[PDB]
Amino acid sequence: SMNPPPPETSNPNKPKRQTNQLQYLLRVVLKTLWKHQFAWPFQQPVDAVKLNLPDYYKIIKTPMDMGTIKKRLENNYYWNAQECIQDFNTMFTNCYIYNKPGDDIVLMAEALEKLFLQKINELPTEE
Ligand SMILES: O=c1cc(N2CCOCC2)oc2c(-c3ccccc3)cccc12
């Protein structure tokens, strides 16, 4: 069994921009989610080999996790906040697609998403 390569986190051809919104996404949003008691499964890509989930990457074709998001924020991969917000949403929706309502991992994702949306409500206006 094999895992796919992780999502891209470095590309010198992709234009980059540091914005106050992206800085908030790293300093407030990512940091707040990372320390939550339910963050740990989401801090790195799903290792479907070690978890014995051989169909995972047959169902989830846009993998995303907060370890990748952290790297993208810390390595200035993004042009805008919407790209980063989309990554968080991809992570949550993957979990809801692959698993059943009320499953433990779904409850964990939902707790993180509730917190994420609360933080997004305070996203600062662009400079
Ligand atoms: O969608 C997912 C399904 C699961 N699975 C299926 C249910 O049993 C446990 C493994 O695991 C996930 C994990 C994870 C769970 C436990 C340990 C490490 C990572 C992290 C992110 C998403 C998923």
Curated annotation (Swiss-Prot):
Site feature location: Acetylated histone binding: N99
Cross-link (Glycyl lysine isopeptide (Lys-Gly) (interchain with G-Cter in SUMO2)) at residue(s): K58
The Bromo domain, residue ranges: 17-123
Highest taxon, organism lineage: Eukaryota
Post-translational modification: Phosphorylation by CK2 disrupt the intramolecular binding between the bromo domain 2 and the NPS region and promotes binding between the NPS and the BID regions, leading to activate the protein and promote binding to acetylated histones. In absence of phosphorylation, BRD4 does not localize to p53/TP53 target gene promoters, phosphorylation promoting recruitment to p53/TP53 target promoters.
Localisation per UniProt entry: Nucleus; Chromosome
UniProt tissue specificity: Ubiquitously expressed.
Bridged cysteine pairs (disulfide): none
Note in the entry: JQ1, a thieno-triazolo-1,4-diazepine derivative, and I-BET, a benzodiazepine derivative, have been tested on tumors with success. Treatment with GSK1210151A (I-BET151, a I-BET derivative) has strong effets on mixed lineage leukemia and promotes myeloid differentiation and leukemia stem-cell depletion.
Family: Belongs to the BET family.
Domains as described in the record: The NET domain mediates interaction with a number of chromatin proteins involved in transcription regulation (NSD3, JMJD6, CHD4, GLTSCR1 and ATAD5).
Disease linked to the protein: Cornelia de Lange syndrome 6: A form of Cornelia de Lange syndrome, a clinically heterogeneous developmental disorder associated with malformations affecting multiple systems. It is characterized by facial dysmorphisms, abnormal hands and feet, growth delay, cognitive retardation, hirsutism, gastroesophageal dysfunction and cardiac, ophthalmologic and genitourinary anomalies. CDLS6 inheritance is autosomal dominant. A chromosomal aberration involving BRD4 is found in a rare, aggressive, and lethal carcinoma arising in midline organs of young people. Translocation t(15;19)(q14;p13) with NUTM1 which produces a BRD4-NUTM1 fusion protein.
Function: Chromatin reader protein that recognizes and binds acetylated histones and plays a key role in transmission of epigenetic memory across cell divisions and transcription regulation. Remains associated with acetylated chromatin throughout the entire cell cycle and provides epigenetic memory for postmitotic G1 gene transcription by preserving acetylated chromatin status and maintaining high-order chromatin structure. During interphase, plays a key role in regulating the transcription of signal-inducible genes by associating with the P-TEFb complex and recruiting it to promoters.
Subunit structure: Interacts with p53/TP53; the interaction is direct. Interacts (via CTD region) with CDK9 and CCNT1, acting as an associated component of P-TEFb complex. Interacts with RELA (when acetylated at 'Lys-310'). Interacts (via NET domain) with NSD3, CHD4, BICRA and ATAD5. The interaction with BICRA bridges BRD4 to the GBAF complex. Interacts (via NET domain) with JMJD6 (via JmjC and N-terminal domains); the interaction is stronger in presence of ssRNA and recruits JMJD6 on distal enhancers. Interacts with NSD3. Interacts with NIPBL.
Protein name per UniProt: Bromodomain-containing protein 4
Species this chain originates from: Homo sapiens
Gene: BRD4
Section covered of the full-length record: 42 to 168 of 1362
